[PDB]
Design an enzyme around this catalytic site. Sequence first.
Site, PDB file in Angstrom:
ATOM      1  N   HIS B 459      28.487  24.305  17.594  1.00  0.00           N
ATOM      2  CA  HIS B 459      28.242  25.533  18.384  1.00  0.00           C
ATOM      3  C   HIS B 459      26.791  25.953  18.263  1.00  0.00           C
ATOM      4  CE1 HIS B 459      29.189  29.317  20.259  1.00  0.00           C
ATOM      5  NE2 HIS B 459      28.761  29.999  19.186  1.00  0.00           N
TER       6      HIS B 459
HETATM    7  C1  LIG Z   1      19.904  33.274  12.873  1.00  0.00           C
HETATM    8  C2  LIG Z   1      21.254  32.621  12.726  1.00  0.00           C
HETATM    9  C3  LIG Z   1      21.579  31.521  13.497  1.00  0.00           C
HETATM   10  C4  LIG Z   1      22.829  30.881  13.398  1.00  0.00           C
HETATM   11  N1  LIG Z   1      23.090  29.811  14.222  1.00  0.00           N
HETATM   12  C5  LIG Z   1      24.254  29.226  14.144  1.00  0.00           C
HETATM   13  C6  LIG Z   1      24.555  28.134  15.007  1.00  0.00           C
HETATM   14  O1  LIG Z   1      23.815  27.781  15.915  1.00  0.00           O
HETATM   15  N2  LIG Z   1      25.799  27.584  14.916  1.00  0.00           N
HETATM   16  C7  LIG Z   1      26.716  27.985  13.962  1.00  0.00           C
HETATM   17  O2  LIG Z   1      27.806  27.425  13.938  1.00  0.00           O
HETATM   18  N3  LIG Z   1      26.448  28.995  13.115  1.00  0.00           N
HETATM   19  C8  LIG Z   1      25.278  29.595  13.208  1.00  0.00           C
HETATM   20  N4  LIG Z   1      24.984  30.654  12.372  1.00  0.00           N
HETATM   21  C9  LIG Z   1      26.008  31.059  11.403  1.00  0.00           C
HETATM   22  C10 LIG Z   1      27.062  31.929  12.025  1.00  0.00           C
HETATM   23  O3  LIG Z   1      26.460  33.026  12.656  1.00  0.00           O
HETATM   24  C11 LIG Z   1      27.998  32.432  10.932  1.00  0.00           C
HETATM   25  O4  LIG Z   1      28.479  31.343  10.149  1.00  0.00           O
HETATM   26  C12 LIG Z   1      29.215  33.188  11.468  1.00  0.00           C
HETATM   27  O5  LIG Z   1      28.820  34.250  12.332  1.00  0.00           O
HETATM   28  C13 LIG Z   1      30.016  33.723  10.318  1.00  0.00           C
HETATM   29  O6  LIG Z   1      31.233  34.247  10.856  1.00  0.00           O
HETATM   30  P1  LIG Z   1      32.088  35.240   9.969  1.00  0.00           P
HETATM   31  O7  LIG Z   1      33.368  35.543  10.633  1.00  0.00           O
HETATM   32  O8  LIG Z   1      32.031  34.855   8.533  1.00  0.00           O
HETATM   33  O9  LIG Z   1      31.148  36.608  10.046  1.00  0.00           O
HETATM   34  P2  LIG Z   1      30.187  37.303  11.110  1.00  0.00           P
HETATM   35  O10 LIG Z   1      30.309  36.611  12.433  1.00  0.00           O
HETATM   36  O11 LIG Z   1      28.840  37.507  10.528  1.00  0.00           O
HETATM   37  O12 LIG Z   1      30.888  38.713  11.302  1.00  0.00           O
HETATM   38  C14 LIG Z   1      30.915  39.680  10.208  1.00  0.00           C
HETATM   39  C15 LIG Z   1      31.012  41.051  10.844  1.00  0.00           C
HETATM   40  O13 LIG Z   1      31.397  42.030   9.851  1.00  0.00           O
HETATM   41  C16 LIG Z   1      30.721  43.242  10.122  1.00  0.00           C
HETATM   42  N5  LIG Z   1      30.712  43.988   8.861  1.00  0.00           N
HETATM   43  C17 LIG Z   1      30.070  43.709   7.683  1.00  0.00           C
HETATM   44  N6  LIG Z   1      30.397  44.532   6.712  1.00  0.00           N
HETATM   45  C18 LIG Z   1      31.338  45.379   7.286  1.00  0.00           C
HETATM   46  C19 LIG Z   1      32.079  46.461   6.793  1.00  0.00           C
HETATM   47  N7  LIG Z   1      32.059  46.833   5.518  1.00  0.00           N
HETATM   48  N8  LIG Z   1      32.951  47.063   7.644  1.00  0.00           N
HETATM   49  C20 LIG Z   1      32.992  46.651   8.917  1.00  0.00           C
HETATM   50  N9  LIG Z   1      32.358  45.629   9.488  1.00  0.00           N
HETATM   51  C21 LIG Z   1      31.539  45.037   8.607  1.00  0.00           C
HETATM   52  C22 LIG Z   1      29.380  42.860  10.714  1.00  0.00           C
HETATM   53  O14 LIG Z   1      28.946  43.928  11.532  1.00  0.00           O
HETATM   54  C23 LIG Z   1      29.702  41.553  11.471  1.00  0.00           C
HETATM   55  O15 LIG Z   1      29.903  41.764  12.857  1.00  0.00           O
HETATM   56  C24 LIG Z   1      23.776  31.355  12.473  1.00  0.00           C
HETATM   57  C25 LIG Z   1      23.437  32.465  11.668  1.00  0.00           C
HETATM   58  C26 LIG Z   1      22.217  33.124  11.818  1.00  0.00           C
HETATM   59  C27 LIG Z   1      21.903  34.319  10.964  1.00  0.00           C
END
Ligand SMILES: Cc1cc2nc3c(=O)[nH]c(=O)nc-3n(C[C@H](O)[C@H](O)[C@H](O)COP(=O)(O)OP(=O)(O)OC[C@H]3O[C@@H](n4cnc5c(N)ncnc54)[C@H](O)[C@@H]3O)c2cc1C
Lengths: 483, 486
Positions: B459
């Site tokens: 992705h």
């Molecule tokens: C610059 C960058 C580029 C990236 N590029 C890629 C890529 O091209 N391909 C790829 O596969 N991955 C990529 N990643 C990694 C990917 O974004 C993450 O692995 C993924 O978003 C993690 O998903 P998740 O469900 O763990 O959390 P996230 O998608 O980060 O969601 C966590 C959510 O929890 C919320 N939150 C936090 N604390 C609290 C709280 N206490 N109460 C309520 N809400 C809260 C935040 O607002 C956030 O929306 C990238 C990351 C970054 C920073």
Amino acid sequence: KAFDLVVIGAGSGGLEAGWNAATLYGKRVAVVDVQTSHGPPFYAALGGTCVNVGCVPKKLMVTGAQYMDHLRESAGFGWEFDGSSVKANWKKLIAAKNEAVLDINKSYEGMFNDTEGLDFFLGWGSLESKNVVVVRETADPKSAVKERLQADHILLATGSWPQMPAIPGIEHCISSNEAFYLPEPPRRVLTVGGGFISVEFAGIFNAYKPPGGKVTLCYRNNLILRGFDETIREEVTKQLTANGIEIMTNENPAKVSLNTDGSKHVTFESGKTLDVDVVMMAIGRIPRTNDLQLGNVGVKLTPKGGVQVDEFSRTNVPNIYAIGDITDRLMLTPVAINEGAALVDTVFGNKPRKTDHTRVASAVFSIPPIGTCGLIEEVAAKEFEKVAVYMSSFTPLMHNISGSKYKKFVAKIVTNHSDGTVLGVHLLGDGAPEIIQAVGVCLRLNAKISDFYNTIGVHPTSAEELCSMRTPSYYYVKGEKME
Amino acid sequence: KAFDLVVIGAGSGGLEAGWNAATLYGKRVAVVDVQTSHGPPFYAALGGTCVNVGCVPKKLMVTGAQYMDHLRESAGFGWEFDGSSVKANWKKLIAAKNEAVLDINKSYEGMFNDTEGLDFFLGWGSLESKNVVVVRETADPKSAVKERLQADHILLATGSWPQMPAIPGIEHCISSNEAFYLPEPPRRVLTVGGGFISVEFAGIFNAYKPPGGKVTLCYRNNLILRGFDETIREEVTKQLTANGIEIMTNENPAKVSLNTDGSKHVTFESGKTLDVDVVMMAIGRIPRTNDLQLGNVGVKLTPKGGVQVDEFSRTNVPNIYAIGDITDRLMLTPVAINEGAALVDTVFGNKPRKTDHTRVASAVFSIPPIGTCGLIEEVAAKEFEKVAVYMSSFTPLMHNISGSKYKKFVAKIVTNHSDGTVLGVHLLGDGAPEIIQAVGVCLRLNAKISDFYNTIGVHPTSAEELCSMRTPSYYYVKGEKMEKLP
Ligand SMILES: Cc1cc2nc3c(=O)[nH]c(=O)nc-3n(C[C@H](O)[C@H](O)[C@H](O)COP(=O)(O)OP(=O)(O)OC[C@H]3O[C@@H](n4cnc5c(N)ncnc54)[C@H](O)[C@@H]3O)c2cc1C
Ligand SMILES: Cc1cc2nc3c(=O)[nH]c(=O)nc-3n(C[C@H](O)[C@H](O)[C@H](O)COP(=O)(O)OP(=O)(O)OC[C@H]3O[C@@H](n4cnc5c(N)ncnc54)[C@H](O)[C@@H]3O)c2cc1C
Ligand SMILES: O=C(c1ccco1)N1CCN(C(=O)C2CC2)CC1
Ligand SMILES: O=C(c1ccco1)N1CCN(C(=O)C2CC2)CC1
Ligand SMILES: [Br-]
Ligand SMILES: [Mg+2]
Ligand SMILES: [Mg+2]
């Protein structure tokens, strides 16, 4: 209010889990996030980090950066235009990115509105008790209560957050979060870190920099992109340098001060100095557990601050689970999504499934990009008595003509030489992220090198190199490299 | 004058067989071709059709043509320049292509020098007898003998040649051979045919046309690209039209005359007329068997005219084999190469191996391009009781920003619904040819739809769509299309 599942974090993993639990298993689901749309002050929002300040906007911006190469490369194919009229309008890029991100934010808002038994709560989610999530006004646990959510089951899916080194002048530096909102493209920028975010943003800034601009990337270690194939690390270093990026390896910022004109004076540990307009720290991402008040329920964290989980995403507390970056394993959107679906299938479907964190296809949207799946040869050589490396590395023909003669395509297949089983496939060059996807499916099916070389090529492609390698380039025998 | 193997045609199949026989099995190899480098008079040369007047120059020219789209699309990402200053210098493109092809011709000359046993002969190969190839000065059998080659084994690998319909004024028309050497890009061009060559060249001409230009593609039947997925045929048609190419279907030239200004007056069977600067015929390629004098040893040809072969590329005459386009099956370079590698691993490796003609990945470098492997649903639906079709079709986000909203990415997986086995995968959009290669490997391994959907996505990519499809869009049950199973 009472829910079968409360999800803290409306991101890649949290939304997969919540939607699946509500729609596939008819559970009543609450999902909590701190913002309904992208950007300051909290950056991530409904949709998660990938949507708001990650994969989605970064890919649009790399696509934008690629036009610097296309415009130059067009000349070799006879395209003519006034080079002196060329401007990279960063304001237009940022506005286009912001609209795309906001549209996604809006569509997730509509998904909650239109999906019965899936409810969104705005604010800061924390654990009051093992079956109660409290939603508060701010990250401060003394802030006002907006909701108290009774939960049979609680999913922690709050993702990660940029690491900022405790150095003097840290306050004068930004992370990727702020980079997405710079109103003007920096003339001079230092990207700090040798990881994908630093490398991808170095490429973005290199394309949009104003006239006489300069992009510098600094990394403490000898060679950028630890974890990637070493030939590709070396070649991508060369290809960035060829496109005008200064790669400073074995260098780290000691401190930052403001020059009188407000620009950033960088002092490196080596006593080198650099004046830049922006210092973007991309040295690491840490799991976001501070705000969750996990001490209220005794969920086990690692010293790092990640939630410890078994293979089924179970914490030490029954009915509390964690998926995605908060688990500090493979920080990828599709992995978080897979872990969320596997958790809901296991817990609510009694369809026991655990995410396979091996042989995960991934990409780096460098210029040019990387696509990879499975083991690098140094890792393979420690686990397998005999390892074969099949390597093809050549400037493709389009790039003799284009004038980018430096753009070598690297294709490498790592095998268990005992049975031919492909352990790893590593690509550098245009198309690599698109090529590697179906290679992921190959490695799930225990493809052998013979399965690759007996497949008929598509010609002309870069991908056909994968199906054209009959004979190993070199071996590792009991960890030792042999021509 | 004594060889283990004599190869007539130093092309995709002939050189693979030649170089393998020599380097792998230390065999003594003669390879014959009519020309050492690209272009008129014989067009194909050392390297074959693909190298000289085929995949290689076509792909360079399609890549050149893609910059028309990139230059426009850059604006959505904030790139600004004087659009009124943009010119497409065709003459530059052709000079660059010529240099690139010549370097490959020289590459193969190097290969043939730097390799023991492997020797090249210039001139026209034909069969004197079972075990003798004669190389002559011309394609006329009466012309001078340059060499008489003794042959324990003979490989026919002479490829194909453009078919030119026998209409009044066909001499005013060109084929793809001449298209590669046009001194100027035509303002108005008619590409005749609905196959990959007509479609690819319509794209090329469309990008390099001078101001007030028009590319017209005509095709005798209702819908271009017969043998491709129907959704993709319809979509390519729309996406070519969106980029200014006029698609005339159910239309076929009946004659061409020269106008007094040197332009071409095309009369269609329908009675319609069109004035163009170039008429490029791309209605078919036919195997090159005439010049080999196969009547002399009784090599059997097919009701169509290709050398008849068994699964091991064996003619009716022992020691005489035929690979690639001369066999008039799937006219692709990697198939020729595969057949050559198998023929040599069989005959000289003592390791018999037969080319698999199923589940062949291929591409059309249309703008945007096609990548396909295995069966289209209409074909699957006649062989399998229950076929499932998985379809994802959307304009990728980058093309909502680029302004090319018409660039819908199409991903289709066709399965045997009884066991989930993937029968075919059909892609339309940027990267499709690159995406499809490792899908060919998946199909070799009998991948099911569940192997795709249980693989974790990369992705963000277009390719990850192939790993996101869990639920059929529709089915064929005993040939019958329906939304839901009974
Ligand atoms: C610059 C960058 C580029 C990236 N590029 C890629 C890529 O091209 N391909 C790829 O596969 N991955 C990529 N990643 C990694 C990917 O974004 C993450 O692995 C993924 O978003 C993690 O998903 P998740 O469900 O763990 O959390 P996230 O998608 O980060 O969601 C966590 C959510 O929890 C919320 N939150 C936090 N604390 C609290 C709280 N206490 N109460 C309520 N809400 C809260 C935040 O607002 C956030 O929306 C990238 C990351 C970054 C920073
Ligand atoms: C415009 C065009 C585009 C194409 N694009 C692609 C593509 O993108 N991908 C793809 O896979 N395929 C493509 N093809 C098809 C590809 O070129 C052929 O399938 C392939 O070259 C066939 O290989 P072959 O070994 O049968 O013969 P060729 O490669 O055609 O080699 C035959 C050789 O035999 C020589 N010859 C003929 N008669 C004699 C004789 N009597 N004596 C001596 N030498 C002789 C000719 O000079 C020629 O060099 C394309 C074809 C064309 C025309
Ligand atoms: O940093 C990344 C990364 C970020 C985005 C895409 O890849 N990685 C993952 C892939 N890695 C591996 O070593 C694979 C597991 C074997 C380590 C490097
Ligand atoms: O004309 C082409 C073509 C030319 C270049 C690339 O593809 N094809 C291939 C795909 N076709 C098939 O029928 C496949 C075998 C199933 C028929 C049409
Ligand atoms: Br290192
Ligand atoms: Mg709802
Ligand atoms: Mg020699």
